[PDB]
Amino acid sequence: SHMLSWLHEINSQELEKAHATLLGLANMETRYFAKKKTLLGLSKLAALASDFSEDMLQEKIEEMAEQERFLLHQETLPEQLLAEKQLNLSAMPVLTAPQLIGLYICEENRRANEYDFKKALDLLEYIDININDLKLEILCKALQRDNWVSKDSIFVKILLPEVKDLLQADEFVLKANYEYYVQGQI
Amino acid sequence: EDRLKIDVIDWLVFDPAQRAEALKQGNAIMRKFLASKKHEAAKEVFVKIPQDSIAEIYLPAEDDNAIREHLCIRAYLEAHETFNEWFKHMNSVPQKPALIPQPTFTEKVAHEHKEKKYEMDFGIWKGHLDALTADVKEKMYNVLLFVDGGWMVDVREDAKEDHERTHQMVLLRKLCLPMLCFLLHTILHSTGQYQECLQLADMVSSERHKLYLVFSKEELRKLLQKLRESSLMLLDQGLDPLGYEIQ
């Protein structure tokens, strides 16, 4: 996908083609998050502006909605840790599900609430190493903040065999919760 | 008949106990005026509404809705005020000094002077322009990304059916949002903010506000063609089509 191709295609009124190349550019992008969004947005507009049938169009806007879901996660990164990590507002690369989950649960991310973690458990399908290794590591730091409330709510938020027990500890209340979970999941 | 509508507002406003009804009927009048782009008219009505009506009024759905609509109309009117000011200023741009090829020594000196004066006149002009530009962008974005559900969209679903109001508001969205989005592009592009022009494609295509539902296919094509023009200007600067450095 040549970076100038969509310009010539928009100019030639070839909007289905421009959409394809903009989607292409967007999928190649990693160096700038702001850029991937713009290209995606441009690609969505070309799709919307073009002569796709309502079927074909419906698909594109769908496979596009998926992509917008992923990006929505890096988009919503709390402003407290973007400053603590001295990060660049939009002058920053396209993070992966890994570096997000980790960064969404870092101890720099103070105010980490239910959603920060609920979202963190959503960024599991966007991976492609050990899966349940972090699956726990998160449910772990989901407690360190509880200062023995949230782990309660995150479970409230799931509706269950994905969580760990014996290996997690590797305890008074843990079991208490691991009891309410039983009556909940059953 | 304008006066008949704009004046019946003086009547409703006379009686404080009737401020909610005054707000609602004023919103209705202004919805009609805005549909024909009669902003002085709408503003004429808008001012007649005591700047303190909202505070006093304090909630049936119709009234909650009327207050929000009222603030939506305020945001819109302001976007047009700032834009007229920006526009008027942009058309007072200082004229480059005229060259006298084969200038006499005297003409070289005069030209040196005018040239430096022009750089002053122009940098002042551009200074005000920057103030005006930043302000009109804030207003456009306020309407376009109107807080909590969208410009001319009810937050409150429990009001009684009013098919007229409801479709008037969908009309306003279709007349006013693409327009603002085009004005906004003119502003960004005119002042060399090409990268932000292209980010208009984000704003319009976003699921958050779903602005694209309000555009006809033809207006989306026009929008894309305009963004392409911004891209070309970015290519001439040695950047890529989205304004990022060519690595």
Residue found by looking up tokens 């996660």 in the block: A73
CB B65 within 8 A of CB B159: yes
Alpha-carbon distance A152 to A114, whole Å? 9
B1-247: CATH class: mainly alpha
Dig out the tokens for B131 from the structure.
Answer: 């103030």
Alpha-carbon distance B6 to B26, whole Å? 8
Domain A91-186: which topology? 1.25.40
Q: Which of B214, B224, B228 to mutate to test the interface with A (most CBs of A within 10 A)?
A: B224
Domain layout of chain A by residue ranges: 1-90, 91-186
CB B107 within 8 A of CB B100: yes
Residue found by looking up tokens 């004429």 in the block: B44
- Does A42 contact B207 at a Cβ distance shorter than 8 Å? no
Question: Rounded to the nearest 10 degrees, what angle do helices B217-235 and B163-190 cross at?
Answer: 10
Chain B's closest residue to A5, CA to CA, is B241
- Does A15 contact B224 at a Cβ distance shorter than 8 Å? yes
- Does B221 contact A49 at a Cβ distance shorter than 8 Å? yes
Domain layout of chain B by residue ranges: 1-247
CB B212 within 8 A of CB B204: yes
Q: Which of A51, A48, A29, A49 is nearest to A38 (CA)?
A: A29
Rounded to the nearest 5°, which phi and psi values hold at B95?
-80, 125
Dig out the tokens for B191 from the structure.
Answer: 């002042």
Mind giving me the DSSP string for B223-235?
HHHHHHHHHHHHH
Alpha-carbon distance B158 to B147, whole Å? 20
Looking at CA atoms only, how far is residue A130 from chain B in angstroms?
Answer: 33
Alpha-carbon distance A20 to A14, whole Å? 10
Alpha-carbon distance A72 to A36, whole Å? 12
HEC sequence for chain A: CCCCHHHHHHHCCCHHHHHHHHHHHHHHCCCCHHHHHHHHHHHHHHHHHCCCCHHHHHHHHHHHHHHHHHHHHHHCCCCCHHHHCCCCCCCCCCCCHHHHHHHCCCCCCCCCCHHHHHHHCCCCCCCCCCCHHHHHHHHHHHHHCCCCCHHHHHHHCCCCCCCCCHHHHCCHHHHHHHHHHHHHHC
Question: Rounded to the nearest 10 degrees, what angle do helices B105-144 and B61-90 cross at?
Answer: 170
Residue found by looking up tokens 């001439």 in the block: B236
Alpha-carbon distance A26 to A24, whole Å? 5
**DSSP SS3 for B245:** strand
Please name the residues in contact with A126: beta carbons below 8 A apart, sequence gap of 6 or more: A70, A96, A97
Alpha-carbon distance A43 to A39, whole Å? 6
Give the number of C-alpha atoms closer than 13 A to the C-alpha of residue A21, restricted to the C-beta side.
15
- Does A38 contact B221 at a Cβ distance shorter than 8 Å? no
Give the number of C-alpha atoms closer than 13 A to the C-alpha of residue B26, restricted to the C-beta side.
35
CB B62 within 8 A of CB B104: no
How many other β-carbons are positioned within 10 Å of the β-carbon of residue B132?
A: 20
CB B191 within 8 A of CB B230: no
Alpha-carbon distance B233 to B245, whole Å? 14
**Partner residue facing B242 (CB), from A35, A45, A49:** A35
Give A1-90's CATH code, choosing from 1.10.150.120, 1.20.58.1380, 1.10.510.10, 3.40.720.10: 1.20.58.1380
Q: Which of B122, B151, B159, B114 is nearest to B24 (CA)?
A: B159
